[PDB]
Write a protein that binds this ligand. Structure first.
Ligand SMILES: C=CC1=C(C)[C@@H](Cc2[nH]c(/C=C3N=C(/C=C4\NC(=O)[C@H](C)[C@H]4CC)C(C)=C\3CCC(=O)O)c(CCC(=O)O)c2C)NC1=O
Ligand SMILES: C=CC1=C(C)[C@@H](Cc2[nH]c(/C=C3N=C(/C=C4\NC(=O)[C@H](C)[C@H]4CC)C(C)=C\3CCC(=O)O)c(CCC(=O)O)c2C)NC1=O
Ligand SMILES: C=CC1=C(C)[C@@H](Cc2[nH]c(/C=C3N=C(/C=C4\NC(=O)[C@H](C)[C@H]4CC)C(C)=C\3CCC(=O)O)c(CCC(=O)O)c2C)NC1=O
Ligand SMILES: C=CC1=C(C)[C@@H](Cc2[nH]c(/C=C3N=C(/C=C4\NC(=O)[C@H](C)[C@H]4CC)C(C)=C\3CCC(=O)O)c(CCC(=O)O)c2C)NC1=O
Ligand SMILES: C=CC1=C(C)[C@@H](Cc2[nH]c(/C=C3N=C(/C=C4\NC(=O)[C@H](C)[C@H]4CC)C(C)=C\3CCC(=O)O)c(CCC(=O)O)c2C)NC1=O
Ligand SMILES: C=CC1=C(C)[C@@H](Cc2[nH]c(/C=C3N=C(/C=C4\NC(=O)[C@H](C)[C@H]4CC)C(C)=C\3CCC(=O)O)c(CCC(=O)O)c2C)NC1=O
Ligand SMILES: C=CC1=C(C)[C@@H](Cc2[nH]c(/C=C3N=C(/C=C4\NC(=O)[C@H](C)[C@H]4CC)C(C)=C\3CCC(=O)O)c(CCC(=O)O)c2C)NC1=O
Ligand SMILES: C=CC1=C(C)[C@@H](Cc2[nH]c(/C=C3N=C(/C=C4\NC(=O)[C@H](C)[C@H]4CC)C(C)=C\3CCC(=O)O)c(CCC(=O)O)c2C)NC1=O
Ligand SMILES: C=CC1=C(C)[C@@H](Cc2[nH]c(/C=C3N=C(/C=C4\NC(=O)[C@H](C)[C@H]4CC)C(C)=C\3CCC(=O)O)c(CCC(=O)O)c2C)NC1=O
Ligand SMILES: C=CC1=C(C)[C@@H](Cc2[nH]c(/C=C3N=C(/C=C4\NC(=O)[C@H](C)[C@H]4CC)C(C)=C\3CCC(=O)O)c(CCC(=O)O)c2C)NC1=O
Ligand SMILES: CCC1=C(C)[C@@H](CC2=N/C(=C\c3[nH]c(C[C@@H]4NC(=O)C(C)=C4CC)c(C)c3CCC(=O)O)C(CCC(=O)O)=C2C)NC1=O
Lengths: 177, 172, 227, 331, 162, 162, 172
């Protein structure tokens, strides 16, 4: 596991040199953008089970073959494991928003997952669909544009960070496909 | 590849003996019932494409997953691969129904194949349901009392259901 | 490094789509490591492969290669590497190579490995240069790593004669090892021609008076017996 | 990932997550906080079931034993034993698969190494056949090994990769066949899902497999099976052999290369997009210029033994067909 | 193993084809010769012993030097006699297998392949066994079609060793 | 042409060897079915005309648009009717050939090869011929094993067009 | 390749007709005599090596030039090639004895061959004498009244002599 700090340290370690002024300046921009990242992680963490609810309910309600008898959502137990997997995907994505680096997600959640879903018989296109719904849902919560919960935040711009979170979800969705 | 005979000779030689009289008597019984065997295989081959396609209609109708986008059945090319796969498994079941022993079905078709339907992300459980859609049709045509002498065929329909259950057991 | 010169191109059978759907006949059976053959079917692949390169009479107990067999049966090589290491084996070089006039060995290589007749004389020219400089090794490297050979045999298949016989006809084309036997019509010319072969003329003797003349009924006899 | 980045080879092998360790450091019964225990409890399920999925319904199973860990009754040694005896652990690991499969799991769950030699297998199978199942489980727990490594107060961890526990070099490679990633558990991994023994020819004969690091091109793969030649007749076209004996060793050392995803759609012949045999749709390779309906690669995963001077060429051809390379080990 | 049945399924498999009516006719023809084949197979098994002992004795009478040579290969010991009857026993066994199967597959698999290298490395002449098989071909005592089924294979092995 | 006989010759040719008993068993089995095959072959030739006319009429009754569609390819002219009966005549001819030869070789050679490309380039469809062959299969009037010899091949062509 | 049957059906289709009743009846007669044909081919195959080597002994003894140095039987490799060529021609005569029609013998062996034994300096006239040494032997084993019931086989023996005369006529 590596944050932004550790990635600057590792790159400067293979460079075999001190971090210096330039790397440090970009990391100063990380720190000044810190509280926006904090409130952003608070936005994704709050109402997150509701995100998983809406996402998987959208996945099944768009594609009704999963709940059809013989499908991979067809069993009550299978629906339980389905819901929990959505929850854990969103969990490690939330970690990748705190760390500012995808190292936790790449080392821990992303790796071995294609071979697991393929090893179970889980349809991968449906998983990338659910990851996509959590992506747009998560960006709409992170931009205070949720149609049900428009909570108070101080006004500002955070398009950078929304592109960052969309990069993590697209990393998972490209990882399962 | 081995038929029913070459397996008995292979065991007998691997022990390095003559074939015993009792073994010969039972083997005479197998030869003495072989017309029925030819008949069954003829009643499968002469309906084979209809078997495949009708089981495909049943399959895609009961599981509507496969056909829609994001599914293996959806691609035009992959749809043909799906149909072909069913044809292949029917072909080898017919071979191993003629030879008597599950030998050609266990080396040319079924061997390594569950490993392969996990490298393609294809639900092998749904493939075994496709084979379960072929077994019922194939036996239902095998037990047609029509054109053929009446009599006893149960001991051989039991021998047909073995292979279809073996393919279904081996893709999963 | 001086590539192969641009040559012409002819029209033989191997470049059409003959619609032999549910093919009835004249398809070699197929000898492939793909079907996971047991001991026997391995031996049938091995014998067929030997005949294809060495072909018939040349294959013999002495020429026979035990070691490439023992490697092939155990999975240590591909069939394509077996065919290659076959041609590099020197017992194939003493017979079919030391005899053949360089342009003619090009026939038996482009034709015993690819299963097609040569397009024109120019093909024999160019390929005979590259076997005249690089050695036999890199020539066989050229044929095997070629796009054509990968396109139709892949990694494990014995080469066959492509489209020798048409679906609706019996004659087709003469068999391949028949077509280019080994000795070249003119190879002997440089040495002493064969001698003391008369006995065969001595044994079959016809008086001149017995021989048919033009306009007799007997000359056409053969036609009558075929009808 | 990359062995070089960060100066640590092991973490990027997929075993980075498993460093976390869990020793109860609190003496005396915990009456009300209920925090450390629910974490340690959860870690016991993560170890013993190896990330298998247990639900509220399935939390009703082993609720008693769970309520005995929380009391001065069981050490985590004995709690882990109690989780290992129960209905669940038998459903998953024991009933579904054979003893060799089951034996190998029981070492992944209880000791966290793999069995190395056949002698471990003989011992545990014989304990089983003499006495049954519960003495099988005891015979894992009731040995010097578990007591020494964990000392009855530490939740079990993976140590088979480590050099400190004594195991045969193969137990290293076998270690990584048994553990693939944080995600991969028991039902999920292809090699050992349910019934199939994870190790058969390899586990028994101490054949060092190779490592395919999890993820990337080589993440999805499984070795093709080999038979034994004329005696006990078996097919010989299934895979390249591990050995490469003989004269070929000329032209440089033999490299055993594993290719991982072979597929019709991916196989292109070097030129982008799927080539059409006929003008209208026919896509399999023509045999004798007659339509065949046989897949160009029969199974996804053929191996290649290739000597050094032919490497580059082979390396090209795999990438021409869109096959992806799992692992390349010099033989 | 090469049977008629595995031959026909192998050919139709190589053509990418179902079993058409042709191969079913072939399997039919295997079944309608198999009764004579088994009648021949039971009498060979029924008196295999005396066929072996008489065969080895015929080999000894034709070749008197074999029972007189000092060397180990020759049946001048108490060992080469037992091993002589051992080898003749092998051939009679394989013939009975091929009469059961219906092609020469068992003999071609278990016996014919590699036999030159044995008879070249151990200085064993091809004729010895030729003489043995000639006695068995003369004294199997079958009649009619069963005798044709036996003499086909017994001739076949002689075609192998010559 | 794919016979049983040429199949056996072809396989033992490919193995480079003299015909073994196996092949002769196959040839036996062709000869022991050939009598029923010829009984079937004579009656189809014996009333081939009424089978053709009945068949084309059945094609018309099942598909009434064919006799009504203004087109080159449809039997609404005086040409597509005669050509309709021409092609039906061809199928029935090839079935009688296959009954004489004893495999599907004449139909696989003279009829089956490249027929999809004809029915693709000329707007031809399997259903029109499928319907024809169903009528022939229902109304040939053979009895017993001759009927099985007819229905085997008649079914076989339906397997080809489907 | 064409048998007895496929020639008749190939002519009939090449004219595009049904088979007339007369053709069917003669074809019934050929089927009604086919056991004798099988018998002959059995009696050739099961003696084939002996046929070859005895005709070789006769050939070399009669025409000694081939065996001595300079000739074509002189080289040991050439000698073996000579023998197995005799085996080849015997093999195709056996094939064309089964099929009834000189079809496989006239495309795979004989066609092209006289051209080949003119590229090697091999006396094809001497090869025809070898075939004349095999015809004698093969017919002399074909007419063995032993283990086979008595009857009339001149109508078939004569046909067999056709093929051996055709090979001798076609290598020269
Ligand atoms: C650390 C990260 C991490 C993950 C991301 C998961 C991934 C994961 N999911 C499952 C397992 C599962 N995952 C699902 C989920 C699905 N149900 C469906 O209808 C959908 C296709 C999909 C949700 C979108 C299901 C149903 C199972 C159980 C499958 C089965 O037993 O048939 C398993 C096997 C073990 C188990 O059964 O729990 C694993 C490793 N686990 C982890 O440890
Ligand atoms: C422990 C919990 C915890 C949090 C939840 C955050 C909450 C937080 N956010 C900001 C501050 C802020 N928060 C946002 C966030 C945004 N504004 C927008 O208009 C977008 C809707 C949204 C995108 C995420 C912005 C833009 C600021 C002000 C800019 C900045 O301080 O960087 C501040 C600065 C102090 C202040 O404003 O009084 C704090 C403490 N920090 C914490 O320590
Ligand atoms: C010699 C025997 C032999 C077989 C038996 C097949 C088996 C097989 N099928 C596929 C491949 C395939 N097989 C199917 C078939 C299926 N479609 C579905 O809806 C069903 C579940 C199923 C039919 C019942 C599909 C769809 C693919 C392509 C999968 C994909 O690319 O996603 C592949 C990979 C190569 C390819 O893409 O063609 C292989 C080896 N191939 C062989 O060589
Ligand atoms: C070359 C092709 C070829 C075939 C297709 C078969 C056809 C065939 N079947 C039987 C004969 C028979 N066939 C069947 C078959 C069955 N009866 C039932 O009621 C079941 C529906 C069915 C199960 C398979 C039975 C029961 C007999 C009679 C019993 C027997 O002869 O063993 C016979 C004996 C002769 C006769 O009845 O006139 C023949 C030749 N044999 C061949 O040579
Ligand atoms: C029973 C026999 C037995 C062995 C032979 C070793 C072999 C071995 N070495 C390492 C592990 C290691 N081995 C080395 C050694 C090397 N450092 C270099 O600069 C050189 C290339 C090389 C010494 C010549 C290093 C550096 C590691 C740690 C690698 C890493 O973590 O990056 C590991 C993994 C476990 C660990 O980290 O200790 C193992 C199994 N272990 C055993 O149990
Ligand atoms: C270049 C060097 C080189 C070697 C040294 C060999 C080694 C070797 N031997 C065998 C294979 C074999 N080797 C033997 C030999 C044995 N029989 C016994 O009774 C003894 C124990 C032993 C002789 C002393 C046998 C019997 C087989 C076949 C084994 C089987 O199929 O059961 C194989 C597998 C392939 C095959 O079947 O041939 C290989 C690679 N091959 C090579 O390429
Ligand atoms: C599967 C088929 C099969 C066979 C057919 C035999 C063939 C065979 N025989 C011998 C070996 C032998 N065979 C004989 C037999 C002979 N004694 C004589 O006086 C006669 C000439 C002749 C009997 C007719 C003898 C004597 C030996 C031992 C030779 C020696 O050691 O000198 C050997 C070498 C191994 C050994 O010593 O046993 C083999 C392979 N073995 C097989 O596995
Ligand atoms: C050896 C076998 C063999 C066959 C089976 C036929 C098949 C066949 N039919 C046609 C051609 C034709 N076939 C038909 C027949 C039809 N009219 C209809 O109303 C019905 C749908 C159908 C009869 C049931 C017609 C009408 C044509 C001419 C089509 C046109 O020119 O538009 C052609 C193109 C050449 C031609 O114009 O004759 C061919 C190859 N030909 C063969 O050589
Ligand atoms: C499919 C049919 C078919 C054939 C009929 C043969 C014909 C044939 N024979 C030879 C080749 C040969 N054929 C003979 C035979 C002869 N020795 C003599 O003393 C006699 C004149 C004569 C036997 C009657 C010899 C000796 C050679 C080798 C000639 C040489 O190398 O000098 C060759 C060249 C290849 C080789 O060396 O084997 C060919 C094509 N091959 C076939 O594929
Ligand atoms: C599968 C192998 C196979 C064979 C090898 C033949 C063997 C064979 N031959 C005949 C039967 C016969 N075989 C011959 C042959 C001849 N008699 C003469 O005196 C001539 C020497 C010789 C010339 C070829 C004759 C004349 C008959 C009896 C007449 C007849 O049945 O047509 C029969 C009839 C049944 C019986 O007699 O018991 C059989 C099965 N058929 C086979 O299926
Ligand atoms: C009829 C079958 C069906 C569903 C089920 C939904 C599922 C769904 N939710 C979406 C997307 C989505 N979902 C939510 C979460 C959700 N909204 C909230 O305000 C709260 C409190 C939530 C949990 C209770 C958000 C926040 C978004 C982003 C859009 C938005 O701003 O609301 C999207 C858009 C996906 C995309 O952008 O690609 C879909 C398809 N749609 C369907 O057609």
């Amino acid at each position: 596991m590596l944050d932004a700090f550790s990635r600057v340290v590792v790159n400067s370690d293979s460079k075999a040199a001190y971090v210096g002024g330039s790397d440090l300046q970009s990391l100063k921009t990380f720190i000044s953008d810190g509280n926006k990242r904090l409130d952003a992680v608070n936005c994704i963490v709050s109402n997150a089970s509701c995100i998983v609810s809406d996402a998987i309910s959208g996945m099944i309600c768009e594609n009704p073959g999963l709940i059809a008898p013989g499908g991979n959502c067809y069993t009550n137990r299978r629906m339980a494991a389905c819901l929990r997997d959505g929850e854990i995907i969103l969990r490690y994505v939330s970690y990748a928003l705190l760390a500012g680096d995808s190292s936790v997600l790449d080392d821990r959640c992303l790796n071995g997952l294609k071979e697991t879903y393929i090893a179970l018989g889980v349809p991968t296109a449906s998983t990338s669909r659910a990851v996509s719904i959590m992506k747009a849902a998560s960006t709409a919560f992170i931009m205070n544009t949720a149609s049900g919960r428009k909570i108070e935040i101080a006004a500002g711009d955070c398009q950078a960070l929304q592109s960052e979170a969309a990069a993590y979800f697209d990393k998972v969705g490209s990882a399962v496909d | 590849m081995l038929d029913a005979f070459a397996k008995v000779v292979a065991q007998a030689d691997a022990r390095g003996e003559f074939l015993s009289n009792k073994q010969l008597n039972s083997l005479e019984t197998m030869i003495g019932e072989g017309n029925k065997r030819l008949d069954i295989v003829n009643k499968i081959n002469s309906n084979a494409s209809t078997i495949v396609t009708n089981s495909a209609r049943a399959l895609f109708a009961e599981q509507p997953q496969l056909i829609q986008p994001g599914g293996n059945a959806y691609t035009s090319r992959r749809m043909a691969a799906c149909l072909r796969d069913m044809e292949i498994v029917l072909r080898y079941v017919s071979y191993a129904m003629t030879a008597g022993d599950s030998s050609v079905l266990d080396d040319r078709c079924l061997n390594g194949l569950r490993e392969t339907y996990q490298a393609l992300g294809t639900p092998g459980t749904s493939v075994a349901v496709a084979i379960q859609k072929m077994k019922e049709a194939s036996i239902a045509l095998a037990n047609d009392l029509n054109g053929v002498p009446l009599g006893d065929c149960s001991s051989l329909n039991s021998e047909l259901a073995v292979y279809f259950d073996r393919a279904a057991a081996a893709v999963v | 490094s001086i590539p192969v010169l641009n040559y012409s191109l002819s029209t033989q059978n191997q470049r059409v789509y003959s619609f032999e759907y549910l093919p009835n006949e004249e398809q070699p059976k197929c000898y492939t490591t793909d079907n996971l053959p047991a001991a026997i079917e391995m031996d049938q692949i091995i014998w067929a492969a030997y005949r294809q390169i060495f072909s018939e009479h040349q294959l013999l107990s002495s020429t026979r290669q035990p070691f490439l067999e023992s490697q092939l049966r155990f999975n240590q090589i591909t069939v394509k590497d077996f065919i290659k290491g076959l041609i590099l084996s020197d017992a194939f070089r003493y017979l079919n190579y030391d005899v053949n006039n360089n342009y003619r060995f090009v026939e038996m290589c482009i034709q015993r490995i690819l299963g097609r007749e040569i397009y024109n004389h120019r093909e024999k020219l160019a390929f005979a240069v590259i076997i005249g400089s690089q050695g036999l090794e890199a020539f066989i490297d050229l044929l095997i790593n070629s796009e054509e050979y990968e396109d139709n045999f892949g990694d494990n298949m014995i080469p066959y004669q492509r489209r020798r016989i048409i679906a609706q006809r019996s004659k087709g084309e003469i068999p391949f090892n028949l077509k280019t036997p080994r000795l070249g019509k003119d190879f002997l010319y440089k040495q002493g021609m064969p001698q003391l072969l008369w006995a065969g003329p001595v044994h079959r003797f016809r008086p001149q008076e017995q021989s048919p003349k033009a306009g007799d009924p007997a000359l056409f006899l053969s036609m009558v017996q075929d009808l | 990932l990359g062995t070089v980045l960060g100066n640590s080879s092991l973490d990027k092998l997929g075993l980075d997550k498993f460093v976390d360790r869990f020793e109860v450091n609190e003496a005396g019964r915990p009456d009300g906080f209920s925090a450390d225990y629910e974490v340690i409890i959860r870690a016991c399920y993560m170890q013993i079931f190896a990330n298998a999925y247990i639900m509220e319904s399935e939390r009703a199973e082993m609720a008693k034993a769970e309520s005995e860990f929380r009391d001065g009754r069981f050490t985590v040694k004995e709690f882990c034993r109690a989780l290992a005896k129960s209905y669940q652990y038998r459903k998953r690991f024991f009933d579904g698969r054979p003893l060799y499969g089951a034996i190998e799991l029981c070492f992944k769950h209880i000791l966290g190494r793999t069995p190395d030699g056949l002698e471990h297998y003989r011992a545990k199978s014989a304990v089983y056949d003499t006495k049954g199942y519960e003495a099988f489980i005891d015979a894992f727990f009731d040995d010097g090994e578990y007591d020494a490594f964990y000392d009855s107060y530490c939740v079990p961890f993976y140590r088979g990769h480590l050099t400190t526990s004594n195991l045969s070099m193969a137990a290293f490679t076998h270690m990584f066949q048994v553990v693939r990633g944080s995600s991969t558990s028991d039902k999920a991994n292809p090699r050992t899902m349910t019934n199939q023994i994870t190790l058969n020819q390899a586990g028994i004969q101490s054949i060092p497999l190779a490592v395919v690091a999890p993820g990337a091109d080589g993440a999805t793969f499984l070795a093709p099976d080999a038979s034994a030649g004329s005696w006990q007749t078996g097919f010989s076209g299934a895979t390249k052999a591990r050995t490469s004996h003989g004269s070929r060793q000329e032209k440089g050392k033999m490299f055993r290369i594993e290719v991982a995803n072979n597929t019709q759609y991916s196989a292109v012949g070097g030129g982008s997009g799927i080539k059409l045999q006929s003008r209208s749709g026919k896509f399999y390779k023509m045999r004798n210029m007659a339509p065949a309906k046989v897949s160009t690669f029969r199974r996804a995963n053929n191996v290649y033994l290739v000597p050094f001077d032919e490497l580059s060429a082979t390396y090209i051809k795999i990438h021409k067909n869109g096959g992806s390379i799992a692992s390349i080990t010099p033989v | 193993m090469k049977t008629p049945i595995t031959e026909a399924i192998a050919s139709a498999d190589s053509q990418g084809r179902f079993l058409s009516n042709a191969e079913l006719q072939s399997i039919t023809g295997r079944y309608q010769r198999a009764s004579a084949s088994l009648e021949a197979a039971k009498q060979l098994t029924g008196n295999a012993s005396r066929l072996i002992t008489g065969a080895a004795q015929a080999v000894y009478t034709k070749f008197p030097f074999v029972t007189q040579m000092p060397g180990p290969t020759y049946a001048s010991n108490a060992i080469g006699k037992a091993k002589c009857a051992r080898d003749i026993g092998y051939y009679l066994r394989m013939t009975t297998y091929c009469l059961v199967v219906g092609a020469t597959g068992p003999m071609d698999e278990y016996l014919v392949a590699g036999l030159e290298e044995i008879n070249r490395s151990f200085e064993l002449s091809p004729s010895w066994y030729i003489a043995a098989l000639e006695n068995i071909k003369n004294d199997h005592g079958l009649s009619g079609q069963a005798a044709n089924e036996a003499n086909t294979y017994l001739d076949y092995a002689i075609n192998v060793l010559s």
